[PDB]
RNA sequence: ACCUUACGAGAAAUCAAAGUCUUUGGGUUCUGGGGGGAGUAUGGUCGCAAGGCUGAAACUUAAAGGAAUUGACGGAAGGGCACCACCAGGAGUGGAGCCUGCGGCUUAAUUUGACUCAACACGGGGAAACUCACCAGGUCCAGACACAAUAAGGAUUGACAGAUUGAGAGCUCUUUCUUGAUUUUGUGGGUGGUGGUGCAUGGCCGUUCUUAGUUGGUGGAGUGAUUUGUCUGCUUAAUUGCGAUAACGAACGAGACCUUAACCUACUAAAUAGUGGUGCUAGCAUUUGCUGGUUAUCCACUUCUUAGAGGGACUAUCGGUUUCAAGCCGAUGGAAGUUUGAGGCAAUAACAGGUCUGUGAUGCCCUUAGACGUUCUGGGCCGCACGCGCGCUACACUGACGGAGCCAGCGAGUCUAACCUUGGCCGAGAGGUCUUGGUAAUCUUGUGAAACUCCGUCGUGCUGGGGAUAGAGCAUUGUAAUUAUUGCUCUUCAACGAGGAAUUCCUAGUAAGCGCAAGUCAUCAGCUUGCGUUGAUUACGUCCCUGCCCUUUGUACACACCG
């Protein structure tokens, strides 16, 4: 179970995702159930950005002890979008000005 | 739940599955003659004189058409 | 004696000795060798005594203990928030009558879940049948498949009439036709279950908490668990930020984002939106005007209506006050200056919170043909001595009744069906009937809503306030309305004269008043989700009460004080 869950989170981050997150909830070896979380990268949680960049999915695996729910959250990288917003809402980038020397001598070029 | 006493009067009368009868198709039998037919058939639009008629007390059935065909003598 | 370093020491707290101790030797005396049993027995010895001093063992036990750390708690000390807390208030509820939900009682059954916030107009739970799970009865198999048995000189199915049955269930029987290998009887093995367990689970939802909280990298402190960063103060809705500063720089949550409402005589456009004209007319005036009607009069227009793209607010400008910083408070301008208003989304860690009765989501347990399956008929969920919780109508002239005026916004609506219904006619009404428009910016529909406004009757009287509880009829939905479905008429016309202790919600188009649409819906709203209409008073604070968070502190707690 961990092999798969570490395997799938490794695969998604190698595929160029910004963050991946898988949850397995269910009875493992005992009557008292327990949730495992397996994460890598970072993910946002709130706002309109989650709708556009997080893809989420839920499954019910039917074992012989009971149902095992499987959640997967994948944060795609905003830079590789090509359709819509290319960055998070509060990303600001100031472009570096190319620095040049002061002239100190007035001249006219002619034609 | 509380209990199941199965209170009701016992009426277990699961039916007879139409008890296998003895040798059938008794049309008539004729010593060195052609046989007429007991249990009159029916002048229907489908039944081709193959279905007989039950002989009840004062009525004649059909069986396959479940409709009385009795007429006055 | 104290303060500071840490050469050094130490398990650390801490220590100028507790240092000069694995690089181990200045001199000397005393005591200890896991926790109990036990400072107990026994024997001495001192003492008037009380007792003192010496002082075991059998046996028993896997820890007892020390110093720190992080939590949890404290009938410990401080700080900070919030109309699910208070302040100043507003409107109430608690009293009454009814409506509805829960407990109780009763019952054949009154099916069940959920009991502080975080159960109780909640399960979209407004149940006549169905739903439906409960009760009294009656059918059916819709018991796959396999193997045996039975058996084409019939394995099995169906029924006319009568008895029966609530019954036109031949269900069962009397009676005898019809069918043809599909079935039937067992053995397995399945299937179905609104049967059980939410304390065996998934998913979803609620709650902590929508408070402001959480975490790495690198550096610093510590042997370490850990700590600082993440803080004395000020500030903010906010660990929001300024400042201090062994910390710098970021991440998640907050914020940004998205939706919506407000501005645009700026752009692009429009009989499914709307003006103005010009035709054609009507009425009144008469001058050179006023108000309408008209769909083939047509020409132009976009202000208002609609939605595409954009613009616009960033607390702008000025003044004041504050390490003169983040900010805060006035004034001006502005459509807009409480986060511009309102939401949607919403961290880490949790909870034995709710849901197996939403699910063909589910493990196991039970049941499976006189069934806990499915269906049909009739009841029940509504039964009423009582106790609670959301509500509706009121207790009256700041009003009731009559006539007249008269204005919204959100929205829904039928075809292979019969939904929204205009108009004409009949009827007091509720309703009936004949046509029509609409699959919709086109028609219902300007949804002519109610409060309200103007004139009138009432005249402080449980009164023309209130309309509960009863009796007769007329209609509508529906297979069916009796424990009245709902609507209408007439009559009967109760409590209640502002409500004890208690207690809820709320800071501007907000509270409160007033209606309408939608959801459920064949019929039924006193419910909910929204929308407009009319529109206040009070405050712009604080920790007093109640909650929650943080700091300091103590701890023998850590399934954590229900220890
Ligand atoms: Mg869970
Ligand atoms: Mg200690
Ligand atoms: Mg009351
Ligand atoms: Mg209910
Ligand atoms: Mg209920
Ligand atoms: Mg049943
Ligand atoms: Mg079943
Ligand atoms: Mg059932
Ligand atoms: Mg559970
Ligand atoms: Mg470090
Ligand atoms: Mg270190
Ligand atoms: Mg660090
Ligand atoms: Mg000032
Ligand atoms: Mg009256
Ligand atoms: Mg309307
Ligand atoms: Mg009466
Ligand atoms: Mg009080
Ligand atoms: Mg109201
Ligand atoms: Mg103490
Ligand atoms: Mg302990
Ligand atoms: Zn025939």
Curated annotation (Swiss-Prot), chain A:
There is a cross-link at residues 18, 27, 37, 86, 98 (Glycyl lysine isopeptide (Lys-Gly) (interchain with G-Cter in ubiquitin)). The modification Omega-N-methylarginine is found at residue 32. It comes from the Eukaryota. The modification Phosphoserine is found at residues 15, 107. It is found in: Cytoplasm. GO terms for molecular function: DNA-(apurinic or apyrimidinic site) endonuclease activity; RNA binding; structural constituent of ribosome. Its main location: cytoplasm. One of its GO terms (cellular component) is cytoplasm. Keywords: Cytoplasm, Isopeptide bond, Methylation, Phosphoprotein, Ribonucleoprotein, Ribosomal protein, RNA-binding, Ubl conjugation. The keyword Cytoplasm applies. Ubiquitinated at Lys-98 in response to stalled ribosomes. Ubiquitination leads to activation of the No-Go Decay (NGD) pathway and degradation of non-functional 18S rRNA: first monoubiquitinated at Lys-98 by MAG2, followed by formation of 'Lys-63'-linked polyubiquitin chains on monoubiquitin by HEL2 and RSP5. GO terms for biological process: cytoplasmic translation; maintenance of translational fidelity; nonfunctional rRNA decay; ribosomal small subunit export from nucleus; ribosomal subunit export from nucleus. Belongs to the universal ribosomal protein uS3 family. Component of the ribosome, a large ribonucleoprotein complex responsible for the synthesis of proteins in the cell. The small ribosomal subunit (SSU) binds messenger RNAs (mRNAs) and translates the encoded message by selecting cognate aminoacyl-transfer RNA (tRNA) molecules. The large subunit (LSU) contains the ribosomal catalytic site termed the peptidyl transferase center (PTC), which catalyzes the formation of peptide bonds, thereby polymerizing the amino acids delivered by tRNAs into a polypeptide chain. Component of the small ribosomal subunit (SSU). Mature yeast ribosomes consist of a small (40S) and a large (60S) subunit. The 40S small subunit contains 1 molecule of ribosomal RNA (18S rRNA) and 33 different proteins (encoded by 57 genes). The large 60S subunit contains 3 rRNA molecules (25S, 5.8S and 5S rRNA) and 46 different proteins (encoded by 81 genes). Present with 146000 molecules/cell in log phase SD medium. This is Small ribosomal subunit protein uS3. The gene is RPS3. The chain holds residues 115 to 225 of 240 of the full protein.
UniProtKB/Swiss-Prot annotation, chain B:
There is a cross-link at residues 28, 34 (Glycyl lysine isopeptide (Lys-Gly) (interchain with G-Cter in ubiquitin)). It is found in: Cytoplasm. The modification Phosphoserine is found at residue 43. A zinc finger (C4-type) spans 42-65. Component of the ribosome, a large ribonucleoprotein complex responsible for the synthesis of proteins in the cell. The small ribosomal subunit (SSU) binds messenger RNAs (mRNAs) and translates the encoded message by selecting cognate aminoacyl-transfer RNA (tRNA) molecules. The large subunit (LSU) contains the ribosomal catalytic site termed the peptidyl transferase center (PTC), which catalyzes the formation of peptide bonds, thereby polymerizing the amino acids delivered by tRNAs into a polypeptide chain. Component of the small ribosomal subunit (SSU). Mature yeast ribosomes consist of a small (40S) and a large (60S) subunit. The 40S small subunit contains 1 molecule of ribosomal RNA (18S rRNA) and 33 different proteins (encoded by 57 genes). The large 60S subunit contains 3 rRNA molecules (25S, 5.8S and 5S rRNA) and 46 different proteins (encoded by 81 genes). This is Small ribosomal subunit protein eS31. The gene is RPS31.
């Amino acid at each position: 179970i961990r092999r798969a869950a570490y395997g799938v989170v490794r695969y998604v981050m190698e595929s160029g995702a910004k963050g991946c997150e898988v949850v397995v909830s269910g009875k493992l070896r005992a009557a008292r159930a327990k949730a495992m979380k397996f994460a890598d990268g970072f993910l946002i949680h709130s706002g309109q950005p989650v709708n556009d960049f997080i893809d989420t999915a839920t499954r019910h695996v039917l074992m012989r002890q009971g149902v095992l729910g499987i959640k997967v959250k994948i944060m795609r990288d905003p830079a590789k979008s090509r359709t819509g917003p290319k960055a998070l809402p509060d990303a600001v980038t100031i472009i570096e000005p190319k620095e040049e020397e002061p002239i100190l001598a007035p001249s006219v070029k002619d034609y | 739940r509380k209990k199941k006493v199965y209170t009701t009067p016992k009426k277990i009368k699961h039916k007879h599955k139409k008890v296998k009868l003895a040798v059938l198709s008794y049309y008539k039998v004729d010593a060195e003659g052609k046989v007429t037919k007991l249990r009159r058939e029916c002048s229907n639009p489908t039944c081709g004189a193959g279905v007989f008629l039950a002989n009840h007390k004062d009525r004649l059935y059909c069986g396959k058409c479940h409709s009385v065909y009795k007429v006055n003598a």
